[PDB]
């Protein structure tokens, strides 16, 4: 993901196989190559509580 | 007999208990920090319902109380008078207009005046039915006020025909009625005698008559008496001669405003304690049974408080200061807890005011309330427009619809016509190439002369340098000719009539309409400001005005130096400091055009002040404008913050630091041709036209010409104070006009005057 | 006219408490400075409630409010303005508005006349607090203390605390539990 | 003060008004916050050929009434008679 909406996307791909393990890669705007318009911090801040009452979410930082 | 009430003074209680009873919630009413309260208009029946109704007891109105009966009621604001207010002391007086036997019964007209301070606030309206057959003749009698009657005294004979009535009554018998205008306002008091037969009939008021200015002014007197009458043939003749001035005039469309849900109270004792009026019909349920009534039927003063409250909210936005007038119709009776839509559209105006009618309905469908509102316009501002852009047929589609636009146009046609011999609306309506004006016959000749008498004076250190306008007409010409490449539309001369004319002519149908507000501010810019006088003031006739329009435009042409194909050393360049940069403020380029000024010691000063920070206008030497021109176009580039430079620096230093920017482009124009054509800049617009540096200093000498032009056009008549007060914002002065000591002096401050010198210096004149 | 425009622009129906979403107390602040810089004293509007972190609640008269309402209106931005491809930075304050279902200015200078007349009826019947008879702490809508540990009255506190005082919610709950309970008005749209 | 006295002197200075505006320059910036603010005008009225003072009392409101409108809630409407003569003449469609 690499927008709030991407993530709420991946939020239910994840509710589709709870069984399942789903690494979440949040990316940023500040990483290398492809790129996005978006902070790094905002949409962490702001999605975390929701990315979190899904237990097959593996939640990974990347970026900077 | 006048009925004297009882003085009153308004307690903030009486009107939290009047405003609660009637369900009056509006915030002008309610006590809030730091405003006084104010009391509706409603409450004037709280004030004068005891001398009011005292009006219907004495023994010559004999009738039962037990069945009387309301029709109607209203309330009329003396204009200028505030409304009334929680501190107020008010004395009440109640006339008892007309007392009249009719087929169904006796009717009692009641007039109600609340004076505050001495002068008179508002008038209330109430008129009283006693159910019953009368014969009590010998104690009716009816005033009625007649519409103005207008007439247009045309040939000889309507003349003779006047002068044949022994009630047409002039002051100079010797005064020529002949092409005037007449209006009679006629007031006609009778007295009955018996069923049809009056038994005097009495008819006066003013007869008036038409000035330029539209003003009307007393002539004589309309005296006409008769016993043992059977009509009033002074009206009749009027009706039948003449045209009835109604001063309502009606929208195209009625325009819906809303329809509102109302109720009637469960009980009538919160109404009646408020206001007085114990009457058992309302209360008692043995009475309103022993009247035979269909039950405790609720006041209809309350009806009328109640519905007015819509009217208040909904069509004046809960202004209360706005509804001057309101009036009501009590159609049928109510009984409590009963609802009412009442439904309210804009019909029409009168004299700036939005004329309102409703219409109230109950439960049934049956009509119970009807009545109608003046309510004010919002704050109303007019702005005259200046030269620049008359296009040719402006105004022209007017012309053909609009009876005032005719008038406006066809006085002012004629006039310059006859005067000057040409036609202001063919030049308006196509846009002539050239105009020969040939000094025929007679008249030819007699038009020639007007031409020769134009002069432009010039008072120079004492000495008066005067000149022909026209230099080429004399007593050997036969003719002259106006020239314009584009279209002489577009030359002054003609361009400032033809707008003084469009506008004035606009603005008498919005007056003919009723549309325009009392208290209206106005100001011109530049030419307009003559047009905005005119249309407000009327302080000249609509000829007077083409005059001074005309030669105020033959004087501009003349004012300056001219080349052989007539070029001009001067000119106008419009500027916008903000493209120079966001930095560059209005002192800065106020700073930059005085020191242009005084470095090449020629001609640029600041002439107009448009929009702060955006649109501004310098004119003078065509050379000076290139200067600013381009001393801007470089300081632009240079990106060079005047204001932060003037911390830095001194003032000598920025001063000097510029001196050398100007004087490295005065070199330039300077050695540029004759009359020099100024070219566009990042902030400088040239104005194409103008060749004239007026409104700078330049036109000084040419003042005292005008000055008596103007005296010879703008009577001391016609000047009248009020229309001008406070609503008149001048362009010399940016401040309304006031005929104070204050205001003097700015004036001579702005121009150095010797008849305001005088004034200002000995200003004791007071008394007469 | 005022509710009519008011209502053209998915704002409330005006009244005296405005709810202000996504802004910094700071910033809602500084709007309404502005807004009460053209405004006499007997009509000006201040912070009511800070119920939590971008979310406040502005109080005065409902004219004055709508006023703020009006500057605020041009601060803003269309709610689907999908600034997706603007750099963050250089976006622009999206938020939310809306006025409070209240017939009163709650927390407002408003009220400070009646705060006198309340205590002076409240003690013309039984009514009084002692923090002898209060069992558990009940912590202060301002101070985030116990209404316990007061050298005054009480009662008068929590008058002069609902009536003249803003409310620091947040502050006011600065206490630590496993759960809360909420016994006040309103379902899921309460205070829970 | 007398009545015909105040005519005869409020007469004078309305000429000299006239006749010197000749020269002085046209103060538009000055009047316009002096209608605008001082008198808070809802309905300013152009009456000229095309709209030119309007855009200039317009242009004057965003450039310093921004505020001072909105806080104040005045609804302030800018009308010229060349184009908004429905809005004066208060006659609309349907």
Redesign the interface.
């Given at each position: 993901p690499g927008s709030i909406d991407a993530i709420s996307q991946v939020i239910n791909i994840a509710k589709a196989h709870p069984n399942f393990p789903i690494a979440l890669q949040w990316t940023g705007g500040r990483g290398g190559g492809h790129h996005s318009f978006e902070d790094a911090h905002t949409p962490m801040l702001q999605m975390y509580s929701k990315i979190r009452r899904h237990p097959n979410i593996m939640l990974i930082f990347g970026s900077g | 007999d006048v009925i004297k009430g009882k003085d009153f003074e308004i307690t903030a209680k009486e009107v939290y208990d009047f405003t609660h009873a009637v369900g009056n919630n509006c915030e002008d009413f309610v006590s809030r920090p730091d405003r006084t309260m104010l009391a509706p208009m409603d409450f004037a029946i709280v004030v004068g319902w005891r001398a009011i109704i005292k009006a219907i007891f004495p023994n010559t109105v004999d009738g039962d109380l037990l069945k009387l009966v309301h029709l109607s009621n209203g309330y009329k604001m003396i204009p200028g008078a505030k409304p009334l207010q929680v501190g107020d002391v008010v004395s009440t007086t109640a006339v008892i207009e007309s007392v009249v036997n009719q087929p169904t019964g006796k009717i009692v007209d009641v007039v109600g005046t609340l004076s505050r301070n001495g002068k008179p606030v508002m008038e209330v309206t109430s008129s009283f039915f006693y159910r019953g057959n009368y014969t009590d003749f010998e104690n009716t009698f009816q005033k009625t006020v007649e519409p103005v009657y207008q007439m247009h005294i045309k040939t000889s004979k309507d003349i003779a025909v006047l002068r044949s009535k022994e009630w047409f009554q002039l002051d100079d018998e010797d005064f020529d009625l002949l092409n005037k205008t007449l209006t009679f306002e006629t007031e006609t008091e009778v007295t009955f005698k018996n069923a049809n037969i009056f038994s005097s009939v009495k008819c006066f008021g003013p007869i008036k008559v038409e000035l330029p200015t539209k003003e009307t002014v007393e002539i004589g007197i309309v005296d006409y008496e008769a016993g043992a009458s059977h009509g009033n043939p002074v009206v009749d003749f009027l009706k039948r001669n003449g045209s009835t001035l109604e001063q309502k005039v009606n929208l195209e469309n009625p325009i819906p405003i809303a329809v509102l849900d109302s109720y009637t109270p469960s009980t009538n004792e919160p109404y009646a304690r408020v206001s007085g009026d114990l009457n058992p019909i309302h209360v008692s349920r043995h009475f309103a049974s022993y009247a035979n009534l269909p039950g405790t039927i609720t006041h209809g003063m309350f009806s009328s408080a109640s519905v007015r409250a819509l009217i208040e909210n909904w069509a004046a936005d809960s202004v209360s200061s706005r509804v001057r007038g309101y009036t009501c119709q009590f159609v049928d009776m109510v009984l409590p807890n009963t609802a009412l839509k009442t439904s309210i559209q804009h019909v029409g105006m009168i004299n700036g005011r939005k004329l309102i009618k409703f219409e109230t309905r109950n439960e049934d469908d049956v009509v119970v309330l009807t009545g109608e509102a003046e309510i004010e316009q919002p704050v109303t501002t007019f702005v005259f427009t200046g030269q620049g852009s008359q296009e040719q047929g402006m105004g022209m589609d007017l012309y053909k619809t609009s009876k005032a636009a005719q008038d406006v146009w066809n006085r002012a046609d004629n006039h310059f016509k006859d005067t000057y011999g040409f036609s202001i609306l063919d030049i308006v309506i196509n846009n002539p190439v050239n105009l020969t004006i040939h000094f025929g016959g007679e008249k030819g000749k007699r038009i020639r002369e007007n031409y020769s008498a134009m002069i432009f004076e010039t008072i120079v250190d004492g000495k008066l340098k005067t000149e022909k306008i026209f230099k080429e007409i004399n007593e050997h010409s036969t003719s002259y000719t106006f020239r314009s490449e584009k279209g002489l539309l577009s030359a002054t001369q003609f361009t400032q009539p033809a707008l003084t004319l469009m506008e004035k002519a606009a603005f008498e149908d919005l007056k003919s309409k009723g549309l325009i507000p009392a208290d209206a501010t106005f100001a011109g810019h530049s030419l307009g400001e003559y047009a905005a006088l005119a249309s407000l003031a009327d302080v000249m006739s609509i000829e007077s005005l083409v005059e001074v329009v005309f030669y105020r435009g033959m004087t501009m042409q003349v004012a300056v130096p001219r080349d052989e194909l007539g070029r001009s050393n001067y000119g106008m360049i419009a500027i916008n400091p903000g493209r120079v940069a966001a930095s560059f403020s209005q002192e800065a380029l106020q700073y930059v055009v005085e020191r242009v000024g005084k470095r090449t010691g020629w001609l640029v000063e600041i002439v107009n002040y448009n929009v702060e920070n955006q649109q501004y206008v310098a004119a003078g030497d065509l050379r000076a404008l290139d200067t600013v021109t381009n001393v801007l176009n470089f300081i632009k580039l240079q990106k060079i913050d005047i204001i932060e430079l003037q911390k830095s620096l001194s003032l000598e230093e920025v001063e000097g630091h510029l001196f050398e920017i100007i004087d490295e482009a005065s070199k330039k124009s300077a050695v540029k041709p004759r009359p020099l054509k100024l070219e566009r800049g990042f902030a400088c617009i040239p104005l194409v036209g103008i060749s004239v540096p007026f409104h700078s200093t330049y036109l000084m000498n040419g003042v005292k010409p005008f000055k008596s032009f103007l005296k010879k056009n703008i009577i001391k008549e016609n000047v009248k104070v009020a229309r001008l007060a406070g609503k008149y914002i001048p362009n010399l002065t940016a401040k309304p006009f006031q005929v104070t000591k204050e205001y003097f002096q700015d004036v001579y401050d702005l121009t150095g005057s010797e008849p305001i010198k005088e004034i200002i210096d000995n200003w004791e004149k007071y008394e007469q | 006219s005022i509710l009519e425009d008011s209502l053209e622009n998915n704002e409330g129906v005006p009244s005296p408490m405005l709810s202000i979403s996504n802004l910094t107390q700071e910033q809602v602040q500084d709007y309404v400075n502005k807004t009460n810089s053209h405004l006499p004293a007997g009509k000006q509007v201040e912070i009511s409630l800070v119920n939590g972190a971008k979310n406040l609640v502005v109080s005065g008269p409902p004219q004055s409010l709508y006023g703020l309402n009006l500057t605020l209106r041009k601060a803003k931005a269309p709610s689907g303005l999908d600034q997706s491809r603007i750099p963050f930075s250089e976006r622009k304050l999206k938020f939310s508005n809306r006025f409070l279902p209240v017939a009163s200015p709650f927390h407002s200078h408003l009220l400070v006349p009646a705060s006198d007349l309340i205590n002076k009826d409240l003690v013309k019947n039984n009514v009084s607090f002692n923090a002898k008879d209060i069992q558990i702490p009940v912590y202060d809508t301002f101070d985030g203390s116990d209404l316990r540990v007061l050298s005054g009255s009480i009662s008068e506190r929590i008058v002069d605390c609902i009536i003249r005082l803003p409310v620091k919610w947040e502050t006011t709950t600065q206490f630590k539990a496993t759960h809360i309970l909420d016994f006040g008005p309103g379902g899921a749209s309460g205070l829970g | 003060?007398?009545p015909?006295?105040?005519?005869?002197?409020?007469?004078?200075?309305?000429?000299?008004?006239?006749?010197?505006?000749?020269?002085?320059?046209?103060?538009?910036?000055?009047?316009?916050d002096?209608?605008l603010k001082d008198?808070?005008?809802?309905?300013?009225?152009?009456?000229?050929?095309?709209p030119?003072?309007?855009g200039?009392?317009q242009?004057?409101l965003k450039?310093?009434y921004e505020?001072?409108?909105?806080?104040?809630?005045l609804?302030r409407?800018i009308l010229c008679?060349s184009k908004d003569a429905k809005e004066?003449?208060?006659?609309?469609d349907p």
């Open positions: - | - | - | 003060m007398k015909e006295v105040e005519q005869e002197l409020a007469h004078i200075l309305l000429t000299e008004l006239l006749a010197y505006q000749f020269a002085s320059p046209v103060r538009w910036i000055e009047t316009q002096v209608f008198f808070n005008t809802e309905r300013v009225v152009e009456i000229g050929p095309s030119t003072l309007a200039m009392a242009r004057t450039n310093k505020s001072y409108d909105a806080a104040l809630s609804h409407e008679y004066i003449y208060y006659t609309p």
